[PDB]
């Protein structure tokens, strides 16, 4: 998701008092409303309760290094919460998919949708689940009767972009005092002019 030409208030996003976890690096959480950037990227995905610790800059595992890499210069903001009452149902239903097998590492902020069967040995299988040829897509373990470590958590990543553009998405003051008949400086979305 891309946020553009919209004013955003992050105070309502914090006063919900329902999120289980909140990790927000790069910028201090109390002073990100006044500071503004150009574009805000929202990446939403589901994950298990034991893999929420893997989502951090400088971690190694089986999900972060194969699905969504976190670089060292990660100024994103991670929000997740417990949604077991809606994302899971009885009957052993999961309705979500992950990737476990890959040939090598991938670049950060890259989406991998390849369904090719990962070959382990030197013998090709011609696209079947033969020996040394395992499908890289596996089933979840979501269940409403589990505990707290395997629950469905909806992780959203709110990253920021550093590039030359006027701040379309920002949290500034809505209206300062209005002064007339004196030589003042104003910024009315198109100029930096000093005059009466």
């Amino acid at each position: 998701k891309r946020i553009s030409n919209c004013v955003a208030d992050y105070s309502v996003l914090y006063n919900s008092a329902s999120f289980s976890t909140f990790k927000c690096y790069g910028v201090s959480p109390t002073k990100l409303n006044d500071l503004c950037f150009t574009n805000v990227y929202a990446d939403s995905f589901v994950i298990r309760g034991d893999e929420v610790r893997q989502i951090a800059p400088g971690q190694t595992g089986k999900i972060a290094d194969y699905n969504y890499k976190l670089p060292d210069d990660f100024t994103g903001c991670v929000i997740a919460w417990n949604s077991n009452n809606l994302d899971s149902k009885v009957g052993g239903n999961y309705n979500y998919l992950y990737r476990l097998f890959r040939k090598s590492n991938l670049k950060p902020f890259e989406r991998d949708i390849s369904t090719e069967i990962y070959q382990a040995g030197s013998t090709p299988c011609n696209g079947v689940e033969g020996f040394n040829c395992y499908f890289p897509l596996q089933s979840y373990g979501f269940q409403p009767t589990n505990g707290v470590g395997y629950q469905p958590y909806r992780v959203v990543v709110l990253s920021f972009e550093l590039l030359h553009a006027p701040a379309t998405v920002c949290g500034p003051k809505k209206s300062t005092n209005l002064v007339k008949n004196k030589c003042v400086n104003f910024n009315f979305n198109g100029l930096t002019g000093t005059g009466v």
Partner: antibody
Amino acid sequence: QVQLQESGPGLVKPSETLSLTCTVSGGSVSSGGYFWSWIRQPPGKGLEWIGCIYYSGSTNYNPSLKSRVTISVDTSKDQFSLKLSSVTAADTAVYYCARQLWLRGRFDYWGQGTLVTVSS
Amino acid sequence: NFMLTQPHSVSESPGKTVTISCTGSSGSIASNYVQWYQQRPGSAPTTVIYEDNQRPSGVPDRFSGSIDSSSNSASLTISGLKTEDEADYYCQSYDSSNVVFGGGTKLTVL
């Protein structure tokens, strides 16, 4: 800047209704979208979280202290007060009214600690 | 049922480096922010570090915190011990709408 001052009777009677009020001078309770909380600390023991409040009716309490903490905020006098029920001899602790902005963060400003102990 | 396990007594000579741990039982340390507090005996507590990697304006650069989510123990590395550093140290968490503090590490004299 801003400072926090506590008031109310320091000594506490057994099995009664505690009344401690924390006042704020140099700022406004309602402005800034600011939270308020109370923290007690027994002598020789660690800090214990009692509860936190907003300038609206939103509040949360420790499950160990649940259904015993009653905290209210009045904007006209610019202060917030806490009421404790069924106080015992194990509740003798140094009470701090806590100034904090981030609910998951830190208590940047701390008021002076009032000594609360069973009366003789 | 989430608590922060903290050592009771930590004692070292001045001028060296120390490590103070803060272990979470159920919830992971990387789930929520951890705040450390330094309090003189008989006074109000003061925040010595917060956000797990950055120092507030006023404290020296010797107060450093590190997080290793594999062992679920919040670490606070303090180097160059002085006279004024003798205090109790408490780590803070949030869990889920319920602020949980640490056991307390009374940093001894010298």
